[PDB]
């Protein structure tokens, strides 16, 4: 159950984000739930904490810029992240909030989470399963998404290198800055993509 | 003149370097000469410099793997620089060749040269204007130079903006390694294009 990593139960979890995130990014949440079980089933991975990160990963997606920066100096965590935001936080500073709420200590679950946007250039299998399923549950629409679903169905590394390389490219098409440790996966995984 | 630069005349060099490189290469340096003089013209960068450095800026384009790496031992350069190739080396490790073959001592010219590819965080206006030089001479006719023309007509900075968002743009597009240098040099300049 949820309650052998968190504070409370599975249900008393989705009546407390239900008053933190609109519907549409709860229902973006129990997506990713959903999608990390099967990729999780897939790929070797426990689902429940596969299951439980994707439930969890955008739990501080509507945390302010203050409360991130006062966990940035309460932690000690690298400085240079005051120079980024909300986009980076979420995942990589957020995992503090979450546990302080949940008393969430599990490792492999806080790292899921933490690096869910940007990826790292070592991944655990957790990790992928967590950074895939955000991009390919049933509610998101965006073109490609079919290629992502896919790729996704015969290979982890492929569908995380498929990932990173759109992300990048969308956020140079976008002209916005991109996180270094962003492109420290794409450089780790892009050869997937041969 | 050249020679007060390099080991000879404009002439010879360039009956040199018609012998190092494919006629349609050498063309390309010959339009980077051109277009970094009217760059330097604009925004305030030593005319003869900027020429110099155009023409010289591919003169490494042609050197083999085995050389660069070779270059690489040499002069005891950054061993990560054996995990990339001839895009990252024929400036960074290039100027090497072009300062045995030419005596390029002028630590100017020489910095232009190097990072003409990926630029880096900081950049002379003479590091600039190489760097554009080489994407908007009259001969490139890829989609979009039209653009980057434009905008080198106005701001050094939103061209090399422009230009850097693009490449990174495009390698993650191919599904390309992007050498970290470049991702220094896209965070930095980012900003001008708004
Ligand atoms: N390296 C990066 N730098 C800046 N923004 C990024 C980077 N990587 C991803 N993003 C952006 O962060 C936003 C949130 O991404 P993500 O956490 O993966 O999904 P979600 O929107 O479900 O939280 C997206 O707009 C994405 O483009
Ligand atoms: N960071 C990078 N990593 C890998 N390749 C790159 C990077 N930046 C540019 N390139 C590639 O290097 C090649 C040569 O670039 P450049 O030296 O700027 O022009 P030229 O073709 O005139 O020598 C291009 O194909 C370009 O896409
Ligand atoms: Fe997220
Ligand atoms: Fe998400
Ligand atoms: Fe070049
Ligand atoms: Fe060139």
Same mark, same amino acid.
């Given at each position: 159950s949820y309650q052998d990593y968190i504070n409370c139960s599975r249900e008393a979890l989705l009546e407390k984000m239900a008053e933190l995130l609109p519907e549409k990014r709860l229902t973006h949440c129990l997506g990713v739930e959903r999608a990390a079980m099967e990729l999780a089933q897939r790929f070797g991975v426990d689902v429940e904490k596969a299951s439980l990160a994707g439930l969890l990963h955008?739990?501080? /997606? /509507?945390?302010?810029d203050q409360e991130f920066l006062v966990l940035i100096d309460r932690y000690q965590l690298d400085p240079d992240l005051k120079n980024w935001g909300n986009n980076v936080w979420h995942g990589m500073v957020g995992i503090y909030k979450i546990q302080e709420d949940?008393?969430?200590?599990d490792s492999e679950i806080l790292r899921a989470i933490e690096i869910?946007?940007?990826?790292?250039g070592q991944m655990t299998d957790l990790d992928k399963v967590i950074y895939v399923a955000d991009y390919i549950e049933h509610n998101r629409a965006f073109p490609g998404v079919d290629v992502a679903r896919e790729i996704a169905s015969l290979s982890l590394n492929k569908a995380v290198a498929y990932e990173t390389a759109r992300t990048v490219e969308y956020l140079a098409h976008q002209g916005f800055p991109i996180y270094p440790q962003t492109l420290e996966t794409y450089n780790a995984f892009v050869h997937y993509l041969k």
């Open positions: 955008d739990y501080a /997606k /509507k945390l302010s949940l008393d969430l200590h869910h946007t940007v990826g790292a």
